[PDB]
Design an enzyme around this catalytic site. Structure first.
Site, PDB file in Angstrom:
ATOM      1  CB  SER A   1      -1.022  -0.053   1.146  1.00  0.00           C
ATOM      2  OG  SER A   1      -0.382  -0.208   2.392  1.00  0.00           O
TER       3      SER A   1
ATOM      4  CG  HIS B   1      -0.859  -5.760   4.289  1.00  0.00           C
ATOM      5  ND1 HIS B   1      -0.439  -5.157   5.449  1.00  0.00           N
ATOM      6  CD2 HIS B   1      -0.398  -4.995   3.281  1.00  0.00           C
ATOM      7  CE1 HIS B   1       0.210  -4.057   5.162  1.00  0.00           C
ATOM      8  NE2 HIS B   1       0.257  -3.936   3.850  1.00  0.00           N
TER       9      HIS B   1
ATOM     10  CD  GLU C   1      -0.394  -2.342   9.138  1.00  0.00           C
ATOM     11  OE1 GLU C   1       0.049  -1.968  10.270  1.00  0.00           O
ATOM     12  OE2 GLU C   1       0.236  -2.216   8.055  1.00  0.00           O
TER      13      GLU C   1
ATOM     14  CD  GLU D   1       2.451  -5.737   7.779  1.00  0.00           C
ATOM     15  OE1 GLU D   1       1.915  -5.490   8.883  1.00  0.00           O
ATOM     16  OE2 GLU D   1       2.874  -4.861   6.995  1.00  0.00           O
TER      17      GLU D   1
ATOM     18  CG  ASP E   1      -1.878   1.468   8.650  1.00  0.00           C
ATOM     19  OD1 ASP E   1      -2.563   2.442   8.251  1.00  0.00           O
ATOM     20  OD2 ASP E   1      -0.878   1.058   8.029  1.00  0.00           O
TER      21      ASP E   1
ATOM     22  CD  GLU F   1       0.375   3.433   9.896  1.00  0.00           C
ATOM     23  OE1 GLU F   1       0.626   2.623  10.809  1.00  0.00           O
ATOM     24  OE2 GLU F   1       0.845   3.286   8.749  1.00  0.00           O
TER      25      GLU F   1
ATOM     26  CG  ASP G   1       2.483   4.760   6.331  1.00  0.00           C
ATOM     27  OD1 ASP G   1       3.622   4.986   5.898  1.00  0.00           O
ATOM     28  OD2 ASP G   1       1.844   3.762   5.997  1.00  0.00           O
TER      29      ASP G   1
ATOM     30  CE  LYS H   1       5.461   1.778   6.071  1.00  0.00           C
ATOM     31  NZ  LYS H   1       4.087   2.055   5.544  1.00  0.00           N
TER      32      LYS H   1
ATOM     33  CB  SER I   1       7.003   1.297  10.069  1.00  0.00           C
ATOM     34  OG  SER I   1       6.138   0.385   9.404  1.00  0.00           O
ATOM     35  CG  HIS I   2       6.921  -4.059   9.187  1.00  0.00           C
ATOM     36  ND1 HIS I   2       6.345  -5.308   9.287  1.00  0.00           N
ATOM     37  CD2 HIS I   2       5.926  -3.165   9.432  1.00  0.00           C
ATOM     38  CE1 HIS I   2       5.068  -5.178   9.610  1.00  0.00           C
ATOM     39  NE2 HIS I   2       4.790  -3.888   9.706  1.00  0.00           N
ATOM     40  NE  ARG I   3       6.414   0.318   3.234  1.00  0.00           N
ATOM     41  CZ  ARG I   3       6.200   1.268   2.319  1.00  0.00           C
ATOM     42  NH1 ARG I   3       7.227   1.998   1.878  1.00  0.00           N
ATOM     43  NH2 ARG I   3       4.954   1.508   1.858  1.00  0.00           N
ATOM     44  CB  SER I   4       3.129  -5.265   3.573  1.00  0.00           C
ATOM     45  OG  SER I   4       3.211  -4.758   2.261  1.00  0.00           O
TER      46      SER I   4
ATOM     47  CE  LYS J   1       3.035  -0.202  10.421  1.00  0.00           C
ATOM     48  NZ  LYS J   1       1.691   0.278   9.903  1.00  0.00           N
TER      49      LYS J   1
HETATM   50 ZN   LIG Z   1       1.008   1.408   3.083  1.00  0.00          ZN
HETATM   51 ZN   LIG Z   2       0.534   2.359   7.003  1.00  0.00          ZN
END
Ligand SMILES: [Zn+2]
Ligand SMILES: [Zn+2]
Ligand SMILES: [Zn+2]
Ligand SMILES: [Zn+2]
Ligand SMILES: [Zn+2]
Ligand SMILES: [Zn+2]
Lengths: 431, 431
Positions: free
Chosen positions: A42, A158, A167, A210, A245, A293, A320, A345, A372-375, A396
């Site tokens: 996303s 996701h 999320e 995730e 999220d 978020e 984000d 990110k 943050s990670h990414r998916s 996260k």
């Molecule tokens: Zn996203």
């Molecule tokens: Zn996000």
């Protein structure tokens, strides 16, 4: 010159969805320092350019050979013989090598692997762990282990299901160590599997990108009681908060100026921004929701501002896609009081220096920072050191499930052990 | 003494299901060498002891604090000051420290992390990569990159669904490099998601423990046409074979002496071993099935032998629960001609020396060796070096999805790159 960059080499590797991404090795006399670039699903429209090949004959166009070539033939040769300790200097060099505002010439995915690996080579040169080195770059006064925000019911792009919002997270805010936080998270996750299996059946407990459960839920309210039940059943009543999220840009229709709560289904459910605020206020009242978020579209600065003010002191509002880890967007967010938390990110912006600058700008203006990670993740653990280095208290990086998520949680265990029992844990506002 | 083992330290970390496991660091002057222990779900009754705490208050009894204590207080102190190059000597020491046939005193999960990390410290002492060092320990004449056998439809205890049999795999046997093999695997995996989504709907494309799809299938035949369709759609007709892991012990009822093809459903489907052989012969005829693992119960030596002889020259029969990487069980398998391929699991036996001995014994008697992950994996990549070191040409380490699987595939890319374009790829019998 014996201590400088000796070799730089990029290669295409797979991410946790099986899509190619870029990894970079920087070699010095102190060894080989390897960093891999994550990838969003996303992705915000204002994110720095993720450069892909578009060759329909390889990975249906998702190859990263061009970004890899840019590392090998353009960026690498510029870095050879250079002093890896000069993080700002080398990041600025790469910015100028690219010469575009969005890193669209070389690719943010070529540049970031280099930025990351340089910082690891430098930490090794100083003879300190990465988190220590990054803390010095950021001027951080106090390291801390973060509260982990575990995305345990997966939706949106996701998963996996009808669920439009992305999320639903649980965060052991009342834990007193990272060790305890992680164990509590896992225990609730395990209880949650049993609850989902009983309510929805066997076919409901497979996982999303995730590592969260992907049950067959459509209604955005429906996961919340299930989360409280799991918290209770695992024996941790009172210890947890919820983080959301919405990734609301993904549901948004620009022409209609409304959000489609059933965008992954044959027929649409059109809902207004005002219908959303009512839902958010209700959520924040009915549950210990401490963080929401992207509650609105990535350019709805007014909507963001309205909810930020309405939940002031109770629930942080996290930019984000609004902010994309980018000081320019962040300045717009500050001016409009649009939000009060940065989702950080590194690959939204594409250099460590810029990501650090974004963190500093946000904290100086009173915001929290959730690293943050990414998916689309890898076995890379950079964000574990980064969140400790920034002392933000919030990360996260997935459910406690799937190796590209647990690698980060485990690296946090190792950092915790190094720092000892006097090391700070958590986010003070939530403790 | 300056070159010897300086420190040994164990810690509890999370596996890819969020369950605790053991990781061990061996420190020498050459650095810190870290190895983590995987964990099975469908564990054979003859596997070496995985020691867990049974404290209902931590991880509902799945803690590994005792195994970690055994590393820290028992094994570690014995190894300090010792020469890490002496792999057989140190493995034998740990065997004797335990003093039981099943490693039930210290735990195979305490011992194995040590065995692994010692071998990595030793490789560093020799100044060679792990795969090179292990090749020397095993007397391997020719390194090769293996064909990866990708478990892309997940069943049994690993998902998620009615499907009783555990693993349906695709293997790019006609690829000419590992790079190509991995890309082809990923492309088919991607095509497969679309096919599953269209046939079964959105809720069908969430993933199991090994990153395969967990569609709502009951019938054990039903995944096979879907696999061929995905192979065709991705553009790779003719390039792939199929591998099965029935994990048939998990369906077996000892008193009834029959297999329950619907053990995850309210009502049972009782099926005989003879009903199974008919199915296997049909599979091997209708599809390019080149490998069937655990087609029968773990003590059905006669059943194993019957199918091994029936598919001789067409489909290898792989012992996993039958053999448990254990020279004693393997000798029984050889004597009865029960199977002709070893599934090699380092944590089924618990030392590198013993796992190597099992590989050598199998190959000397004409069997193939498929190096294997467990369904509970970590970010650890040891089996990537191990499979290259053994030159076996066969690995199963997951679908191309989830970081605890892709970490291994990626490490294989790195090894391939080091070895260059003249490096052998694949399993000759399948090429
Ligand atoms: Zn996203
Ligand atoms: Zn996000
Ligand atoms: Zn020097
Ligand atoms: Zn020395
Ligand atoms: Zn098994
Ligand atoms: Zn098996």
């Amino acid at each position: 010159s014996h201590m400088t960059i000796q070799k730089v080499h990029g290669r295409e590797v797979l991410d946790s969805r099986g899509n190619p991404t870029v990894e970079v090795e920087v070699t010095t006399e102190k060894g080989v320092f390897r960093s891999a670039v994550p990838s969003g699903a996303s992705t915000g429209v204002y994110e720095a350019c993720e450069l892909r090949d578009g060759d329909k004959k390889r990975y249906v166009g998702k190859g990263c050979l061009q970004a890899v070539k840019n590392v090998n033939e353009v960026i690498g040769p510029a870095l050879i013989g250079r002093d890896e300790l000069k993080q700002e200097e080398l990041d600025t060099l790469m910015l100028r090598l690219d010469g575009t505002p969005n890193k669209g010439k070389l690719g943010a995915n070529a540049i970031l692997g280099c930025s990351m690996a340089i910082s690891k080579a430098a930490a090794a040169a100083k003879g300190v762990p990465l988190y220590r080195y990054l803390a010095s770059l950021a001027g951080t006064k106090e390291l801390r282990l973060p509260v982990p925000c575990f995305n345990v019911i997966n939706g949106g792009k996701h998963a996996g299901n009808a669920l439009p919002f992305q999320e639903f997270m649980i965060a052991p805010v009342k834990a007193t160590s990272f060790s305890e936080a992680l164990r509590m998270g896992s225990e609730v996750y395990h209880s949650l599997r049993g609850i989902i299996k009983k309510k929805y059946g066997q076919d409901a407990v497979n996982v999303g990108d995730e590592g969260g459960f992907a049950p067959p839920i459509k209604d955005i309210n429906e996961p919340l009681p299930i989360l409280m039940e799991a918290i209770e059943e695992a024996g941790h009543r009172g210890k947890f908060a919820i983080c959301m999220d919405c990734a609301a840009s993904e549901t948004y229709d620009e022409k209609k100026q409304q959000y489609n709560l059933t965008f992954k289904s044959p027929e649409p459910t059109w809902v207004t921004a005002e219908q959303l605020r009512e839902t958010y206020c209700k959520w924040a009242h009915d549950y210990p929701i401490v963080s929401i978020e992207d509650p609105y579209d990535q350019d709805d600065f007014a909507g963001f501002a309205g909810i930020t003010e309405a939940l002031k002191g109770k629930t942080q509002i996290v930019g984000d896609d609004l902010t994309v880890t980018n000081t320019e967007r962040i300045k717009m967010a500050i001016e409009k009081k649009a939000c009060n938390s940065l989702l950080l990110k590194i690959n939204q912006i594409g250099t460590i220096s810029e990501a650090i600058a974004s963190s500093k700008l946000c904290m100086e203006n009173g915001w929290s920072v959730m690293v943050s990670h990414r998916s689309g993740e890898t076995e890379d653990t950079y964000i574990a050191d980064l969140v400790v280095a920034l002392g933000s208290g919030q990360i996260k990086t997935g459910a406690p499930c799937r190796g590209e998520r647990t690698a980060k949680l485990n690296q946090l265990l190792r950092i915790e052990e190094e720092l000892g029992a006097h090391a700070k844990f958590g986010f003070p506002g939530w403790s």
